[PDB]
Design an enzyme around this catalytic site. Sequence first.
Site, mmCIF file in Angstrom:
data_model
loop_
_atom_site.group_PDB
_atom_site.id
_atom_site.type_symbol
_atom_site.label_atom_id
_atom_site.label_comp_id
_atom_site.label_asym_id
_atom_site.label_seq_id
_atom_site.Cartn_x
_atom_site.Cartn_y
_atom_site.Cartn_z
ATOM 1 N N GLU B 67 0.886 -1.140 -0.136
ATOM 2 C CA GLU B 67 -0.063 -0.114 0.039
ATOM 3 C C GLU B 67 0.955 1.320 0.091
ATOM 4 O OE1 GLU B 67 -3.378 -0.456 2.865
ATOM 5 O OE2 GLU B 67 -3.832 -2.539 1.781
ATOM 6 N N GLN B 112 -7.212 0.162 -3.010
ATOM 7 C CA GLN B 112 -8.295 0.105 -4.110
ATOM 8 C C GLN B 112 -8.241 1.222 -4.967
ATOM 9 O OE1 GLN B 112 -12.463 -0.688 -1.552
ATOM 10 N NE2 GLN B 112 -10.701 -1.218 -0.825
ATOM 11 N N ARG B 115 -9.232 8.070 -6.991
ATOM 12 C CA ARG B 115 -8.321 8.706 -7.871
ATOM 13 C C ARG B 115 -6.952 8.795 -7.666
ATOM 14 N NH1 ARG B 115 -10.678 11.721 -10.998
ATOM 15 N NH2 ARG B 115 -9.621 13.065 -12.698
ATOM 16 N N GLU B 185 -4.249 -8.858 -1.813
ATOM 17 C CA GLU B 185 -4.694 -8.962 -0.178
ATOM 18 C C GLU B 185 -6.151 -8.768 -0.250
ATOM 19 O OE1 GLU B 185 -2.274 -6.801 2.653
ATOM 20 O OE2 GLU B 185 -4.069 -6.037 3.362
HETATM 21 O O1 LIG Z 1 -7.372 -7.574 14.881
HETATM 22 C C1 LIG Z 1 -6.386 -7.247 15.786
HETATM 23 O O2 LIG Z 1 -5.734 -7.923 16.309
HETATM 24 C C2 LIG Z 1 -6.361 -5.899 15.744
HETATM 25 C C3 LIG Z 1 -7.166 -4.911 16.544
HETATM 26 C C4 LIG Z 1 -6.837 -3.789 16.344
HETATM 27 O O3 LIG Z 1 -8.299 -2.782 16.831
HETATM 28 C C5 LIG Z 1 -6.621 -3.096 14.959
HETATM 29 O O4 LIG Z 1 -6.469 -1.949 15.107
HETATM 30 S S1 LIG Z 1 -7.216 -0.811 14.244
HETATM 31 O O5 LIG Z 1 -8.738 -1.305 14.856
HETATM 32 O O6 LIG Z 1 -7.161 0.424 14.907
HETATM 33 O O7 LIG Z 1 -7.160 -0.938 12.955
HETATM 34 C C6 LIG Z 1 -5.480 -4.104 14.529
HETATM 35 O O8 LIG Z 1 -5.662 -4.633 12.919
HETATM 36 C C7 LIG Z 1 -4.568 -5.085 12.198
HETATM 37 C C8 LIG Z 1 -4.731 -6.509 11.902
HETATM 38 O O9 LIG Z 1 -4.940 -7.404 12.973
HETATM 39 C C9 LIG Z 1 -3.580 -7.030 10.886
HETATM 40 N N1 LIG Z 1 -4.046 -8.306 10.092
HETATM 41 S S2 LIG Z 1 -3.484 -9.698 10.985
HETATM 42 O O10 LIG Z 1 -3.475 -10.846 9.923
HETATM 43 O O11 LIG Z 1 -4.569 -10.068 11.891
HETATM 44 O O12 LIG Z 1 -2.126 -9.246 11.482
HETATM 45 C C10 LIG Z 1 -3.303 -5.893 9.925
HETATM 46 O O13 LIG Z 1 -3.962 -6.023 8.679
HETATM 47 C C11 LIG Z 1 -3.780 -4.836 7.744
HETATM 48 C C12 LIG Z 1 -2.934 -5.152 6.651
HETATM 49 O O14 LIG Z 1 -1.628 -5.567 7.190
HETATM 50 C C13 LIG Z 1 -2.867 -4.134 5.477
HETATM 51 O O15 LIG Z 1 -2.156 -4.514 4.316
HETATM 52 C C14 LIG Z 1 -4.125 -3.687 5.142
HETATM 53 O O16 LIG Z 1 -4.464 -2.210 4.876
HETATM 54 C C15 LIG Z 1 -5.442 -1.573 5.040
HETATM 55 C C16 LIG Z 1 -5.163 -0.399 6.346
HETATM 56 O O17 LIG Z 1 -4.609 -0.758 7.311
HETATM 57 C C17 LIG Z 1 -6.644 0.488 6.439
HETATM 58 N N2 LIG Z 1 -6.375 1.168 7.731
HETATM 59 S S3 LIG Z 1 -6.668 0.602 9.263
HETATM 60 O O18 LIG Z 1 -6.323 -0.727 9.327
HETATM 61 O O19 LIG Z 1 -6.117 1.303 10.277
HETATM 62 O O20 LIG Z 1 -8.073 0.846 9.455
HETATM 63 C C18 LIG Z 1 -7.018 1.059 5.212
HETATM 64 O O21 LIG Z 1 -8.089 2.059 5.460
HETATM 65 O O22 LIG Z 1 -7.220 0.115 4.248
HETATM 66 C C19 LIG Z 1 -6.150 -0.684 4.100
HETATM 67 C C20 LIG Z 1 -6.445 -1.514 2.764
HETATM 68 O O23 LIG Z 1 -6.853 -0.581 1.636
HETATM 69 S S4 LIG Z 1 -7.707 -0.740 0.432
HETATM 70 O O24 LIG Z 1 -9.413 -0.902 1.224
HETATM 71 O O25 LIG Z 1 -7.982 0.780 -0.139
HETATM 72 O O26 LIG Z 1 -7.618 -1.802 -0.361
HETATM 73 O O27 LIG Z 1 -5.392 -4.445 5.950
HETATM 74 C C21 LIG Z 1 -4.823 -4.025 7.374
HETATM 75 C C22 LIG Z 1 -6.422 -4.201 8.131
HETATM 76 O O28 LIG Z 1 -6.838 -3.116 8.425
HETATM 77 O O29 LIG Z 1 -6.810 -5.254 8.166
HETATM 78 O O30 LIG Z 1 -3.014 -4.688 10.658
HETATM 79 C C23 LIG Z 1 -4.287 -4.296 11.327
HETATM 80 C C24 LIG Z 1 -4.292 -2.724 11.389
HETATM 81 O O31 LIG Z 1 -3.358 -2.567 12.357
HETATM 82 S S5 LIG Z 1 -2.894 -1.023 12.967
HETATM 83 O O32 LIG Z 1 -1.576 -1.144 13.813
HETATM 84 O O33 LIG Z 1 -2.758 -0.259 11.585
HETATM 85 O O34 LIG Z 1 -4.094 -0.368 13.465
HETATM 86 O O35 LIG Z 1 -5.214 -5.023 15.312
#
Ligand SMILES: O=C(O)C1=C[C@H](O)[C@@H](OS(=O)(=O)O)[C@H](O[C@H]2[C@H](O)[C@@H](NS(=O)(=O)O)[C@@H](O[C@H]3[C@H](O)[C@@H](O)[C@H](O[C@H]4[C@H](O)[C@@H](NS(=O)(=O)O)[C@H](O)O[C@@H]4COS(=O)(=O)O)O[C@H]3C(=O)O)O[C@@H]2COS(=O)(=O)O)O1
Lengths: 74, 385
Positions: B67, B112, B115, B185
């Site tokens: 990303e 995704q 723009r 992903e």
């Molecule tokens: O589930 C947990 O253990 C957990 C709970 C926390 O509440 C959560 O933090 S949050 O709520 O503040 O977001 C955090 O989530 C993790 C997640 O567990 C982990 N995946 S794993 O397999 O379980 O280890 C990982 O997932 C992310 C991917 O690594 C990443 O490539 C992709 O990007 C997202 C982006 O993170 C997202 N922002 S956000 O996550 O802060 O909300 C953004 O808006 O969209 C991206 C995708 O783009 S797209 O839709 O345009 O295609 O996905 C991630 C995901 O969010 O699942 O990391 C997350 C987030 O960790 S944190 O440190 O950033 O908060 O842990």
Amino acid sequence: QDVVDLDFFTQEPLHLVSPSFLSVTIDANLATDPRFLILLGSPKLRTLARGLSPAYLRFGGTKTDFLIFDPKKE
Amino acid sequence: KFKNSTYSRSSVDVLYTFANCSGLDLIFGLNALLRTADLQWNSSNAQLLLDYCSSKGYNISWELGNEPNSFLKKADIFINGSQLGEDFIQLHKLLRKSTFKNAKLYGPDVGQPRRKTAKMLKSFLKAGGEVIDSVTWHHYYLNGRTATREDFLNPDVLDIFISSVQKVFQVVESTRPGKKVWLGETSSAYGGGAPLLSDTFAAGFMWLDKLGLSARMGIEVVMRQVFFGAGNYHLVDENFDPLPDYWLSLLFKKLVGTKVLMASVQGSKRRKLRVYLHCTNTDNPRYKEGDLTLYAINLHNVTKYLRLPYPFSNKQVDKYLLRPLGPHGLLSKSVQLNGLTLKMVDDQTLPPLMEKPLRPGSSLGLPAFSYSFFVIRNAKVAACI
Ligand SMILES: O=C(O)C1=C[C@H](O)[C@@H](OS(=O)(=O)O)[C@H](O[C@H]2[C@H](O)[C@@H](NS(=O)(=O)O)[C@@H](O[C@H]3[C@H](O)[C@@H](O)[C@H](O[C@H]4[C@H](O)[C@@H](NS(=O)(=O)O)[C@H](O)O[C@@H]4COS(=O)(=O)O)O[C@H]3C(=O)O)O[C@@H]2COS(=O)(=O)O)O1
Ligand SMILES: *[C@@H]1O[C@H](CO)[C@@H](O)[C@H](O)[C@H]1NC(C)=O
Ligand SMILES: *[C@@H]1O[C@H](CO)[C@@H](O)[C@H](O)[C@H]1NC(C)=O
Ligand SMILES: *[C@@H]1O[C@H](CO)[C@@H](O)[C@H](O)[C@H]1NC(C)=O
Ligand SMILES: [Cl-]
């Protein structure tokens, strides 16, 4: 009424997907867990993974860009 | 919020051996935020990893960055697509000099196509497209923090995926026509998944629909976030027990072949009853060349009955209908296949996946809020041989 007629296009394939079409990830974040070796050593998890073969396993996620290889660390 | 951390040779070995013993092909994401004072990618750490992997004889494919559209937010560094493209060119030169000179390289793993992301993907493909083997991008329908149950069942939510796919192909066809496009992903909801939703039977409507649409629209590989991990969208939970989306994925794997066909509903209502058609997977021992696999989603609140068209109307059909195990209905973490709970036989043994043969000529029953596969036996479709 709840009966629905389907229409099928069957003359030729419209696309060809990979044999690995349904693939999976392991998030980069998991390699920061103290128990990574226990987790991915699990014979139960390997059995589940084998069920989805052939597939790609993609290792990546947000932490991709905050991980550095250190060849000295144990 | 994101600190640097290190990983070891041990970790690399854990990962590779997991993939190797499982029959999976490993794709490893390299760190793109290692930068020179000129803002070029500094390849030195990747070089260390490549040499190590080469020395162990590991067959590995590569990505660089995740990303990159979000780097300014994540790291306060902006890398434009042109620069990223040049960074991929440099990685490709390293691979060509390595022991695995034909190793594959995928990217750029953009989110995704909003723009600004679309413009970054375009300039990336103009600069670095010649050296990538497939174009990778990511998709999530919803924010896990605010997602509702109703969103998981809403065809207007399912339908938003179509427009993202169309935008990605518009960018690729304007720059690198014919290059394969992968979903690198993807899942239901970001932020680790929607609590109490992304790990349930209800998650399967999104997963199966995404598979169906992806295959239909020309996406070659879809990578599910995540096989195992802390997020709710895991296929396998922290006790190493499979969730409904695991069993759905295993069935898809066993039944659905590589050749994509098309199905549609004559009525043209076309939103809550969703249908997909491929040739049957030729590795399935039960079935033969020429058989068809239909899969369908019913998001109506009543049973629908599907009638097959000529010349398939009187064929023997094998049903594989998935329903939740109660009492939690769509919010259940357990599933039944044709009325039998899917469960591991022991730690080394997946269960058999038992079909229900239907009476030849019967209409295909699809209960409210359910999904099913139907294998049409002896279909003798020439396109599937
Ligand atoms: O589930 C947990 O253990 C957990 C709970 C926390 O509440 C959560 O933090 S949050 O709520 O503040 O977001 C955090 O989530 C993790 C997640 O567990 C982990 N995946 S794993 O397999 O379980 O280890 C990982 O997932 C992310 C991917 O690594 C990443 O490539 C992709 O990007 C997202 C982006 O993170 C997202 N922002 S956000 O996550 O802060 O909300 C953004 O808006 O969209 C991206 C995708 O783009 S797209 O839709 O345009 O295609 O996905 C991630 C995901 O969010 O699942 O990391 C997350 C987030 O960790 S944190 O440190 O950033 O908060 O842990
Ligand atoms: C790249 O990084 C290494 C280690 O962090 C550093 O010592 C080296 O001088 C850097 N290379 C360039 C070209 O800046
Ligand atoms: C992209 O970034 C590079 C490196 O910082 C810069 O020199 C170049 O002008 C930029 N390209 C565009 C189109 O802005
Ligand atoms: C199906 O949906 C509608 C919502 O308008 C509802 O009124 C109807 O009674 C529902 N049917 C069943 C069987 O629950
Ligand atoms: Cl409707």
